[PDB]
C-alpha cells in the first residue's frame, strides 16, 4: 500500500561527496531486490517539484502525454551503476547537474508519480 505519490518521494526526492549515490541508492531501497541501473535525485523542495505538474506539458519519453517539464533547471544528482556493480554489491557513480526535470503526473491532488527525464 505504498501510494504512487509516496513511491516518487522515496525514489526521487532529497530536498536536503562523490559517494552520495552509493549512500543514497541503498538508503532509499533502490539496491534491495536489484541494482536499479539509473536513478535521479532532486534537491529542491517537494513543493517546487510538485508544482512542475502545473508547468510545461510535454510528451514523456515513452510517448505518454501527461508529462510536465520544469521552467527552471533544478539541482539534481544522477546515479548510474558502475562496471564492477553486480548484485548484491551494487555500486554507483555520482554526477551532479542542474537541468530541467520532466515528471509524469497523476491523481487528485495532481502530483508526480514518475521521474521521466532531465534536459
Amino acid at each position, epitope marked *: 500500500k505504498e501510494t504512487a505519490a509516496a513511491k516518487f518521494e522515496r525514489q526521487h526526492m532529497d530536498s536536503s561527496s562523490s559517494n552520495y549515490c552509493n549512500q543514497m541508492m541503498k538508503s532509499r531501497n533502490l539496491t534491495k531486490d536489484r541494482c536499479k541501473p539509473v536513478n535521479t535525485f532532486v534537491h529542491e523542495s517537494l513543493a517546487d517539484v510538485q508544482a512542475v505538474c502545473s508547468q510545461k506539458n510535454v510528451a514523456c519519453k515513452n510517448g505518454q502525454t501527461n508529462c510536465y517539464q520544469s521552467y527552471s533547471t533544478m539541482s539534481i544528482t544522477d546515479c548510474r551503476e558502475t562496471g564492477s556493480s553486480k548484485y548484491p554489491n551494487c555500486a554507483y557513480k555520482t554526477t551532479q547537474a542542474n537541468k530541467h526535470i520532466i515528471v509524469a503526473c497523476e491523481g487528485n491532488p*495532481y502530483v508526480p508519480v514518475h521521474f521521466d527525464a532531465s534536459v
Partner: nanobody
Amino acid sequence: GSQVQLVESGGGLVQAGGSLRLSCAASGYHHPYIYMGWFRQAPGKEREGVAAMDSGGGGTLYADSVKGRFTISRDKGKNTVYLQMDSLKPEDTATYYCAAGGHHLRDHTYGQWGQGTQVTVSS
C-alpha cells in the same frame, strides 16, 4: 488572470433522441494541452472517459457506448475542445467534465478539470 480555468458551456436538458453540444475553452495556460477530453459521471456510476483528442486533432478516442453518436473536435493552436452529442439516450444523463493535460482517456492522468456541466436526457 493568475489561475487556469476550463470554461464549460452548452449541455443541459434534452429529450431522448435529441442533440446537444458541449464546449470547453481553457484560459490562463500558456502552452498547448497535448490532450483534452470530456469525462462524465452518471447517477450510480463511476467517472468514465467519453472522448479525447490531441492537440493536432488526431489520437481521437471514444467510450464504446458513444461511438458514432458523439463527435469530439478541437481548435488547432488553441486549448478548446467540443463534444457534439447526437442521438442522446437516457443513460447519457451525467455531469460532464472538461479535462486537460492528461493522457488519452485515463482520468487519473488529467490534472485540470472543469467544474462539471449537467446533461439531462429525459424519457
